[PDB]
Design a protein around this motif. Sequence first.
Motif, PDB file in Angstrom:
ATOM      1  N   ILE A 148       0.839  -1.209   0.000  1.00 28.53           N
ATOM      2  CA  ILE A 148       0.000   0.000   0.000  1.00 28.53           C
ATOM      3  C   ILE A 148       0.870   1.255   0.000  1.00 28.53           C
ATOM      4  CG2 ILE A 148      -1.622   1.382   1.405  1.00 28.53           C
ATOM      5  CD1 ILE A 148      -2.833  -1.364   2.279  1.00 28.53           C
ATOM      6  N   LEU A 149       1.810   1.341   0.948  1.00 28.71           N
ATOM      7  CA  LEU A 149       2.616   2.550   1.065  1.00 28.71           C
ATOM      8  C   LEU A 149       3.469   2.797  -0.183  1.00 28.71           C
ATOM      9  CD1 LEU A 149       3.542   1.956   4.711  1.00 28.71           C
ATOM     10  CD2 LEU A 149       2.307   3.996   3.782  1.00 28.71           C
TER      11      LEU A 149
ATOM     12  N   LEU B  47      10.116  -1.540   8.199  1.00 25.96           N
ATOM     13  CA  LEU B  47       9.598  -0.553   7.254  1.00 25.96           C
ATOM     14  C   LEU B  47      10.222   0.806   7.565  1.00 25.96           C
ATOM     15  CD1 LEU B  47       7.599   0.679   5.152  1.00 25.96           C
ATOM     16  CD2 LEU B  47       5.838   0.457   7.014  1.00 25.96           C
TER      17      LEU B  47
ATOM     18  N   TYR C 106      -8.348   2.928  -1.932  1.00 24.32           N
ATOM     19  CA  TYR C 106      -8.134   2.440  -0.577  1.00 24.32           C
ATOM     20  C   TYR C 106      -9.199   3.010   0.336  1.00 24.32           C
ATOM     21  CZ  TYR C 106      -3.649   0.710  -2.138  1.00 24.32           C
ATOM     22  OH  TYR C 106      -2.630   0.015  -2.814  1.00 24.32           O
ATOM     23  N   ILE C 107      -9.613   2.207   1.310  1.00 28.28           N
ATOM     24  CA  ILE C 107     -10.458   2.675   2.412  1.00 28.28           C
ATOM     25  C   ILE C 107      -9.571   2.780   3.634  1.00 28.28           C
ATOM     26  CG2 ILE C 107     -12.474   2.116   3.833  1.00 28.28           C
ATOM     27  CD1 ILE C 107     -12.905   2.790   0.842  1.00 28.28           C
ATOM     28  N   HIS C 108      -9.596   3.932   4.309  1.00 21.69           N
ATOM     29  CA  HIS C 108      -8.658   4.080   5.423  1.00 21.69           C
ATOM     30  C   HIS C 108      -9.077   3.189   6.604  1.00 21.69           C
ATOM     31  CE1 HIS C 108      -6.323   5.590   8.741  1.00 21.69           C
ATOM     32  NE2 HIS C 108      -5.576   6.297   7.907  1.00 21.69           N
TER      33      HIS C 108
HETATM   34  C1  LIG Z   1       7.734  11.844  16.674  1.00 24.26           C
HETATM   35  C2  LIG Z   1       7.201  10.662  15.890  1.00 24.26           C
HETATM   36  O1  LIG Z   1       6.679   9.723  16.445  1.00 24.26           O
HETATM   37  N1  LIG Z   1       7.417  10.777  14.476  1.00 24.26           N
HETATM   38  C3  LIG Z   1       7.060   9.835  13.448  1.00 24.26           C
HETATM   39  C4  LIG Z   1       6.476   8.656  13.751  1.00 24.26           C
HETATM   40  C5  LIG Z   1       6.151   7.846  12.704  1.00 24.26           C
HETATM   41  O2  LIG Z   1       5.593   6.598  12.927  1.00 24.26           O
HETATM   42  C6  LIG Z   1       4.877   5.986  11.892  1.00 24.26           C
HETATM   43  C7  LIG Z   1       3.699   6.545  11.434  1.00 24.26           C
HETATM   44  C8  LIG Z   1       2.969   5.919  10.446  1.00 24.26           C
HETATM   45  C9  LIG Z   1       3.459   4.734   9.916  1.00 24.26           C
HETATM   46  C10 LIG Z   1       4.606   4.136  10.386  1.00 24.26           C
HETATM   47  C11 LIG Z   1       5.347   4.778  11.373  1.00 24.26           C
HETATM   48  C12 LIG Z   1       4.852   2.827   9.639  1.00 24.26           C
HETATM   49  C13 LIG Z   1       3.677   2.626   8.767  1.00 24.26           C
HETATM   50  N2  LIG Z   1       2.865   3.848   8.918  1.00 24.26           N
HETATM   51  C14 LIG Z   1       1.661   4.121   8.232  1.00 24.26           C
HETATM   52  O3  LIG Z   1       1.091   5.191   8.375  1.00 24.26           O
HETATM   53  N3  LIG Z   1       1.263   3.063   7.393  1.00 24.26           N
HETATM   54  C15 LIG Z   1       0.039   3.166   6.587  1.00 24.26           C
HETATM   55  C16 LIG Z   1      -0.601   1.975   6.324  1.00 24.26           C
HETATM   56  C17 LIG Z   1      -1.760   1.978   5.564  1.00 24.26           C
HETATM   57  C18 LIG Z   1      -2.288   3.176   5.062  1.00 24.26           C
HETATM   58  C19 LIG Z   1      -3.619   3.118   4.247  1.00 24.26           C
HETATM   59  N4  LIG Z   1      -4.447   1.917   4.548  1.00 24.26           N
HETATM   60  C20 LIG Z   1      -5.442   1.697   3.490  1.00 24.26           C
HETATM   61  C21 LIG Z   1      -6.231   0.447   3.941  1.00 24.26           C
HETATM   62  N5  LIG Z   1      -6.777   0.520   5.289  1.00 24.26           N
HETATM   63  C22 LIG Z   1      -7.592  -0.647   5.666  1.00 24.26           C
HETATM   64  C23 LIG Z   1      -5.775   0.773   6.317  1.00 24.26           C
HETATM   65  C24 LIG Z   1      -4.960   2.034   5.882  1.00 24.26           C
HETATM   66  C25 LIG Z   1      -1.624   4.385   5.340  1.00 24.26           C
HETATM   67  C26 LIG Z   1      -2.178   5.722   4.849  1.00 24.26           C
HETATM   68  F1  LIG Z   1      -3.282   6.025   5.553  1.00 24.26           F
HETATM   69  F2  LIG Z   1      -2.495   5.649   3.590  1.00 24.26           F
HETATM   70  F3  LIG Z   1      -1.269   6.729   4.972  1.00 24.26           F
HETATM   71  C27 LIG Z   1      -0.454   4.404   6.101  1.00 24.26           C
HETATM   72  N6  LIG Z   1       6.415   8.143  11.478  1.00 24.26           N
HETATM   73  C28 LIG Z   1       7.027   9.316  11.195  1.00 24.26           C
HETATM   74  N7  LIG Z   1       7.363  10.139  12.179  1.00 24.26           N
END
Ligand SMILES: CC(=O)Nc1cc(Oc2ccc3c(c2)CCN3C(=O)Nc2ccc(CN3CCN(C)CC3)c(C(F)(F)F)c2)ncn1
Length: 274
Positions: A63-64, A89, A134-136
Amino acid sequence: GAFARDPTQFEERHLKFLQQLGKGSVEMCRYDPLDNTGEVVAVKKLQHSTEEHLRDFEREIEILKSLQHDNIVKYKGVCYSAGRRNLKLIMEYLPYGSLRDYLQKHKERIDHIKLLQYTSQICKGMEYLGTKRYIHRDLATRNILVENENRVKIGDFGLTESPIFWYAPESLTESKFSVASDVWSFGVVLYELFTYISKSPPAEFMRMIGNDKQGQMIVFHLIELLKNNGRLPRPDGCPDEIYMIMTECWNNNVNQRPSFRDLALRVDQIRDNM
Ligand SMILES: CC(=O)Nc1cc(Oc2ccc3c(c2)CCN3C(=O)Nc2ccc(CN3CCN(C)CC3)c(C(F)(F)F)c2)ncn1
């Protein structure tokens, strides 16, 4: 098959720990191939690579890999550690963490203009996600991240405060998730933004249902409340026009909910009309 991404792009021996960020689990690391420099990155680890959990993590990575937008968290790559017998990841690092935390910790630099800017950016990230079909499902300020005071990005931490208080009625009763139930959840995110100053959706719903209730009885009463027009109240200081956007998102008639394109336009027009 093969590796899901380039196994030489982030070599484990050069990925250096900086800080724990959340517990899956996320860490800050520095990638220093190469002298105590290099880019700072966020790194997600899976607790238990079962057949199912690893399948799920691969799907998350796929997805990402497909998403590139200013208001979506930025994928960088994967790291195959433990001698390429484990997967991690690699993402862009966003210093201010989740929007839920930021609204609580940095009230000094938040006003209604900024809240509407964030609202607009969330709608635009969601427009983009819908083009990718995609559905969030999990839209909530705990899953939105803050790059700086002018920019937020949608994500999904996926490390696990009940999510039921963001779900549309047909998601609670039929497990039906759609773009339109993401719009319902967006209405809850907009409520969260304007309560930022005992106001959370779980606390407010629990007050309405009865604070002494436990277990499935909570779910039963939440469903019955929502089916008959029970809603989160207007936050103190929230303009009537913004509460009206919330209430239009919270329509039990799925097809009458606005689109994310409708919402981005309305929010940007309200911001521009000042
Ligand atoms: C200070 C601090 O903590 N800073 C940070 C932290 C931080 O931690 C993270 C934050 C987010 C994410 C990760 C680590 C690893 C994976 N991740 C993430 O958002 N994954 C993700 C997975 C599925 C989906 C989209 N799907 C579509 C299907 N759905 C059923 C589910 C969602 C999405 C979206 F919504 F499209 F962006 C995103 N990242 C950057 N900076």
